[PDB]
Amino acid sequence: SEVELVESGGDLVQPGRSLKLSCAASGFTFSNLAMAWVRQTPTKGLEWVASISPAGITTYYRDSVKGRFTISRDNARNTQYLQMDSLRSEDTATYYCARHTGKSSFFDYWGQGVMVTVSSGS
């Protein structure tokens, strides 16, 4: 029916640790469209983090997260993931779930946003 994307994997985490995000989807055939992750940094604006092919074979990453972040998906459960390893004080942002319109690189629908904060204290 109606398209909806819901994220859940937000938390407060220490620097250098790991954290895996999860985005649930409904309202469309999940195994037919490419998904992506976008984050809203307190200073560095809006950043595209990663995108993944419909079947998950091909993945694109941005330079600042290449090697640390891993994007994945489980088409059986209509869910995509974002495994953030070796977190940094710059990875703290609001992470949004986004669906590519078709085979293009702009996004039909978005998620509501999940909060990830990387900090030791203060």
Partner: protein, 150 residues
């Protein structure tokens, strides 16, 4: 044969509308992450014809260079050869460009009627194509050139 080209249309048209559909949902900008890509004679004819579309002149433009390469026009018999070709764009007749345009019309027929129609209209459109091609001498015109393999 006129009867052979009639039935070869079934695979040529279906292979045409399939690849015509794969390019109408291509990217607009940089393409999203795509999975790696990892086919009879009439099935491949539909693929080679699947490009172009409304820019049928791209077939005419290429047919210009190849025609300018075949007869190799000069300046002695140019005005006779020039007006003859220019008139061939508007005269009644059948050329390979107009046949592909007929296929593209079937694509817009099968597609645009599926949206506003009660059923999926793939089988009923090949019927519309075979009936029209066989009648208006298109099947005979194609057959006398060797067949779809052209």
């Amino acid at each position: 044969s006129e009867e052979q080209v009639a039935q070869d249309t079934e695979e040529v048209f279906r292979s045409y509308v399939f690849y015509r559909h794969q390019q109408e949902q291509e990217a607009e900008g940089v393409a999203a992450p795509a999975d790696p890509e990892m086919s009879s004679t009439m099935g491949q004819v539909g693929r080679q014809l699947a490009i172009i579309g409304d820019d049928i002149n791209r077939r005419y433009d290429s047919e210009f260079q190849t025609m300018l390469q075949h007869a190799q026009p000069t300046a002695e018999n140019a005005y006779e050869y020039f007006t003859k070709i220019a008139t061939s764009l508007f005269e009644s007749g059948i050329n390979w460009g107009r046949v592909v345009a007929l296929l593209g019309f079937g694509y817009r027929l099968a597609l645009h009627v599926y949206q506003h129609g009660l059923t999926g209209f793939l089988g009923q459109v090949t019927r519309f194509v075979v009936d029209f091609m066989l009648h208006h001498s298109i099947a005979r015109w194609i057959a006398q050139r060797g067949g779809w393999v052209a």
